[PDB]
Design a protein around this ligand. Structure first.
Ligand SMILES: O=c1cc(CP(=O)(O)O)c2cc3c(cc2o1)OCO3
Length: 270
């Protein structure tokens, strides 16, 4: 509890300036030390479920060889706002692996819905999360309905701690086989949507993979990441926000500041 107490006050000040709630869980995988702030509260996943979705696809690809190379064709009605990759391949289709990369690295919404369909919907993704020991995660809806971020609504939420614990298992632990684990890491490392969030807190010489989420209402946005500082074990962390009013805006700078405090609390000089 020592490290959590070290940063309790700056976290409270940060969220009060933000005007909402900030949830953080950070784990140093070397020492096992952790930093928590509102780490067991539920926050909306927004797009951050798409990382776990790709991991669930990779897990299935261990038993279904050729799943990743399977071409998926889709119609115009499958396109959803913020489908920047899949809209370019509407007339050709894309492979499951390409859809997974697009979902992770561009937060592509049509790609996410197509992969959800492959897995049996929100309950199928939830079942995968249960299979790795995550009893907190729940996905209930599809894009874009899952972004409603209604205060008090448990649908389409998890906790920062559960997100970090599941991310650790999938990227560093044994939840995925070694080739699939590295592919998941590589997709996270190539994300293009998180330059102003956890990455803004990480020195240029450290490797980082992340997945963002932005609900667009209720000041609700997030990012989770694995960070490989030089000379020490990797850090896994999750930063989630929400706010009381529908029109409250999220803040990427607040997410970056919260990540900085978490790393400072862990003693990670950065
Ligand atoms: O700033 C953002 C960033 C994201 C991508 P991510 O942070 O969720 O991953 C975003 C995605 C959207 C959207 C607005 C968004 O605003 O409307 C439909 O899909």
């Amino acid at each position: 509890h020592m490290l959590t107490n070290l940063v309790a006050e700056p976290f409270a000040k940060l969220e009060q300036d933000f005007g909402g709630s900030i949830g953080v869980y950070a784990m140093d995988t070397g020492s096992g030390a952790t930093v928590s702030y509102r780490a067991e509260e539920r926050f909306p996943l927004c797009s951050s479920f798409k990382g776990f979705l790709a991991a669930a696809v990779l897990a299935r690809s261990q038993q279904q060889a050729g799943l990743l190379d399977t071409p998926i064709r889709y119609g115009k009605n499958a396109l959803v706002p913020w489908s920047p990759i899949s809209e370019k391949y509407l007339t050709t289709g894309m492979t499951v692996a390409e859809l997974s990369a697009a979902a992770v690295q561009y937060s592509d919404n049509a790609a996410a819905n197509l992969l959800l369909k492959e897995l049996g919907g929100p309950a199928g993704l939830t079942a995968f999360m249960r299979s790795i020991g995550d009893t907190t995660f729940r996905l209930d809806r599809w894009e874009l309905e899952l972004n409603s971020a209604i205060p008090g609504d448990a649908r389409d939420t998890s906790s920062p701690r559960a997100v970090t614990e599941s991310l650790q298992k999938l990227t560093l632990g044994s939840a995925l086989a070694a080739p699939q684990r590295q592919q998941f890491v590589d997709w996270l490392k190539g994300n293009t949507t998180g330059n102003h969030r956890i990455r803004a807190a990480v020195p240029a010489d450290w490797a980082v993979g992340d997945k963002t989420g932005t609900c667009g209402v209720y000041g609700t946005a997030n990012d989770y990441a694995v960070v490989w500082p030089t000379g020490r074990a990797p850090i896994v962390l999750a930063v989630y926000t929400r706010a009381p009013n529908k029109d409250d805006k999220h803040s990427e700078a607040v997410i970056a500041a919260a990540a900085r405090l978490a790393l400072e609390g862990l003693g990670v000089n950065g």
